Design a protein around this ligand. Structure first.
Ligand code: FMN
Length: 108
């Protein structure tokens, strides 16, 4: 299937993005100049279920994996449905270093 992929840096307190696949830019309508160094939450908007947003926020603090269905918005404002799965990446000493996320547009 069609998917995008991003990398967040968990050694920084707010998990900024540090690498995004070609499709993530092409999908969301954002450029690296507006994406790298920012938390992925810039994709959210009015109809984004605060309950699901909390499932990922909580999962990041605990360092667990997490799969949620969110309502994101492109740069032009048009909504799309994003199936997000974040995976914690730990170092040998168990601490979390990176968060990896596959995003799928399941607007169908
Ligand atoms: C976003 N993708 C995404 C990818 C990774 C690797 C991570 C760690 C998070 C996301 N998010 C969530 C966002 O960064 C944040 O964690 C949430 O907003 C919850 O935290 P707050 O502080 O806001 O309560 C993604 N969110 C999206 O909406 N779209 C994605 O593609």
């Amino acid at each position: 299937l069609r998917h995008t992929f991003v990398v967040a840096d968990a050694t920084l307190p707010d998990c900024p993005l540090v690498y995004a696949s070609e499709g993530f830019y092409a999908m969301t309508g954002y450029g690296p100049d507006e994406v790298l160094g920012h938390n992925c939450r810039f994709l959210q908007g009015e109809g984004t279920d605060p309950k699901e947003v909390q499932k990922i926020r909580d999962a990041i603090k605990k360092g667990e994996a997490c799969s949620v269905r969110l309502l994101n918005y492109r740069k032009d404002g048009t909504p799309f449905w994003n199936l997000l799965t974040v995976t914690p990446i730990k170092t040998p000493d168990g601490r979390v270093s990176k968060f990896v996320g596959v995003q799928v547009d399941v607007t169908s």
